Symmetry: D2
Subunit: 262 residues, 4 copies
């Protein structure tokens, strides 16, 4: 009988962003000092890029097949995703495919992504507030950039907006690909006549979307579009995995998944 | 090759509430005049009560097993649930269990519940507004009573609240068992100092929760608690399946599920 | 927690043959007096015929869906099939589809058909010998009519032939649809120059194949073809479920399946 | 859309035995010159030994996870097993676990092991005869050593014995772990009073069982036990994959599996 933990993120090949994930690995090791920890990545293109750099970057299926070969029997897979969207659901299907395979893993549990229950959503709103830069002043809006998805779990973003507004009317959620859109965010900012606006990723790592769509020099970045509107945009290139308060939520989900192995 | 449709609701044994579901059956027949329509119910206690009254009330598993015996080969199962919560997810698992069974159904698709994508959520908010009683005046709040759940899909309720507020600041979502709670709703009403408040179910049928928790004579009903606060509460005992605008959304989800059989 | 047994046969709509299955139901009740026993049938055409006669004849899927509705939690499904062929394999898939369904059965085990392990095959050969009519004389061949199948489990028939020959060189296996064929059986009989030959079904019940293909008045029956060869054919219209010795083997498989629920 | 073939054997770490599997790889390449061929092994201990020698030896799960990462979409998995026993069944479950995984393989078919249908069993008996050493004389028995298993598919061995005896009364099947046993084989040889007896593996490769249990210097080997009985034992250390006639059967099963991808 041999327990293991498999941490699974979307992943990033951005050098400057990868430390957020290393930090999570430290937290997990610190919380569970006697349980081996393994990594996988859900984005096929990030795995390609990492392999190109000479770095092992297993898919969840490669990682679980390898852990079965090492003789693990019970594995808690922790999603480092923000919402229970397409990546998370693919992860559940994969995990459950491995469970019970002849001579393989006995039990594979899966920890919820960040915005799990409405209780989690409320905890995330509280944690995001705790994570805000000390230099942000009262009344300066903060826009959290979620990925957005066509999947039904996109509803987690307007859901989170509800909880954030019960803390501070000037905290806003926008997404690259889903709802609310950045145009919705700009309309929110116009009604507030805000002159300085902070932008923080609502992704575990500050990857390509944070560096390019949120804060890029390109004309269509959020920071470029705000500057054209006469707003001083203040992008913060830190993923949510950098925050202890936000990280605690994934850590509790991992505790829950570990308990489900028993 | 033989196509069928299986309509699946939570269900109700309340005589006065069941017509909402009959209405849905009419709409579906009208839209798909050549495809047999069958019914099932996800709540084990409602099936027990209906059987007690001498009424057939198959589980999704009983219904699909019976349709396989009739020689259906491709069945679109339409969820008449509001959110993709525990009932919906149980329905997907069941549907997919039947698909491909030796000598049974070839393909079983499942239509999304009402609050599917963020696009659906936005359409639901628009449809709820279209459904409001003509006697409700501008500025009188309306509280939509969702069921609420411990499942992650509870986030659909604060999500819907976001879309409703982009239409009218005085439209509110509360739930019996999840978030937002009715205490959250009362705090919303207190800030608005509202003197007349409408209450509408955010369930397909106006069942036990609408008749007892929302509008009961008992002390803890929403209407009783509002009356104690000096508010004229105006409960509307109509499920969302009574609305043509709301029903259209489930009908489009059924179209989508039918298309997925091909 | 509620245990049930589901007995599953190919089935028959032949009035005179059905008592063999009733006998099995008695044996099972006698062995497991406190466990409810339910029936299903794997042949879609037999279920059609039985329903036509006004008799309930559930498919395995209908039966299990109904047992879930009665609140059974652990069900041992016993195959009353002779080989682990297509019907048995369809039964396993169905059983396993029901296991773990939300709010349904917790555990569904499946008992092996008659010719399970090589130890079972050897026990079957011994039991068939014990079942022979007292009037059959030493040296008179006995031909056991198996169904035969295109499935790989057809190999159970030549397998059983091996074990039967270690008991008596004049015991022969033939099949309607697989190998050995009846032409192979006739060649076996020609080398033996046998003048009187017994024919016994190697099916649980003496159904259509026993009454028509093995013993029919039609020209192509086994008894007709033997009579044309000058052989006195002595058909015995008793299914193997009539034999206590043969029945014990299915009963042990049911014990094994019951044990697997724990 | 990208087709691949995955050849899966029990495997061997015996240097002298591995060429039989290389031969199969050549045959497959020759038959399907444009389709990439990959290898996996079902025995966990053989994979351990091969890894110890610095050789990649993926499990079926490792191999399929890697092929998904290479962007294969349709993979025909060919079993190089002799019977549809526990290894084969584990292989089917694994193959089917990978099929349809999000962003992974679309279709994974599995080719039957050697003794598939009764038609295959008859073809195997014919192929074994074609494979016999030219020096074996008429009337000298040949004993084929199968592995044997507790699984129901052990019945394939007495089944094959039936077909072999329709070709030559002196061809015998024994197994290490199942039925018929080697003691059964010795009793067959005693009735024949045979003075010279050939021993051939009924495994794809002449691995540990062929080299040690069938032909070892140890007292309990088949060749040692025969020599004690005054029989000249003539072991042939060639696996069945060395035979063109036997190999053709696995090749047809691979054709069938390739066709099932369409
Ligand atoms: C707001 C949260 C969730 C939403 C909105 C949601 C919605 C959906 C939808 C739409 C599907 C159909 C497949 C697709 O549309 O791509 C699905 C399938 C499924 N869900 Fe969820 N789901 C949620 C959470 C969960 C969670 C937390 C679990 C964990 C057990 C789960 C388990 C499954 C499974 C096993 C399937 C089968 C289909 C698939 O993998 O996509 N769902 N869900
Ligand atoms: C001599 C005995 C058996 C033989 C020759 C055999 C052969 C096969 C074959 C050929 C398939 C592929 C599907 C098909 O060809 O129709 C299969 C599938 C399978 N077998 Fe067996 N099998 C045997 C016994 C068993 C037993 C006793 C079990 C009980 C666990 C089992 C479990 C399964 C399962 C779960 C599948 C998946 C595919 C299907 O349902 O047909 N098999 N087997
Ligand atoms: O990456 O969108
Ligand atoms: O019913 O809660
Ligand atoms: O019935 O063949
Ligand atoms: O290896 O037995
Ligand atoms: Co993106
Ligand atoms: Co309720
Ligand atoms: Co037949
Ligand atoms: Co062995
Ligand atoms: Na995000
Ligand atoms: Na990114
Ligand atoms: Na609701
Ligand atoms: Na209700
Ligand atoms: Na039979
Ligand atoms: Na019959
Ligand atoms: Na073998
Ligand atoms: Na070996």
């Amino acid at each position: 009988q041999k327990t293991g933990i498999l941490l699974v993120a979307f992943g990033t090949s951005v050098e400057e962003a990868r430390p957020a994930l290393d930090k999570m690995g430290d937290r997990v090791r610190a919380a569970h000092p006697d349980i081996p920890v393994r990594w996988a990545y859900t984005a096929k293109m990030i795995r390609a890029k990492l392999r190109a750099e000479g770095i092992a970057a297993p898919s969840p299926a490669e990682a679980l097949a390898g852990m079965a070969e090492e003789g693990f029997t019970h594995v808690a897979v922790q999603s480092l995703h923000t919402i229970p969207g397409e990546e998370f659901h693919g992860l559940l299907e994969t995990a459950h495919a491995f469970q019970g395979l002849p001579k393989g893993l006995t039990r594979v549990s899966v920890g919820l992504p960040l915005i799990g229950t409405t209780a989690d959503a409320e905890a995330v709103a509280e944690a995001l507030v705790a994570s805000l830069p000390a230099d942000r002043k009262p009344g300066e809006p903060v826009v959290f950039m979620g990925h957005g998805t066509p999947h039904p779990a996109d509803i987690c973003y307007p859901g989170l907006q509800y909880y954030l507004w019960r803390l501070d009317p000037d905290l806003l959620v926008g997404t690259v690909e889903g709802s609310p859109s950045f145009d919705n965010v700009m309309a929110e900012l116009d009604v507030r006549k805000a002159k300085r606006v902070w932008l923080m990723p609502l992704m575990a790592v500050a990857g390509d979307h944070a560096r390019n769509d949120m804060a890029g020099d390109e004309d269509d970045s959020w920071t470029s579009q705000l500057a054209r509107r006469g707003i001083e945009a203040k992008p913060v290139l830190h993923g949510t995995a950098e925050s202890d308060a936000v990280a605690a939520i994934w850590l509790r989900h991992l505790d829950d998944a570990l308990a489900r192995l028993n």
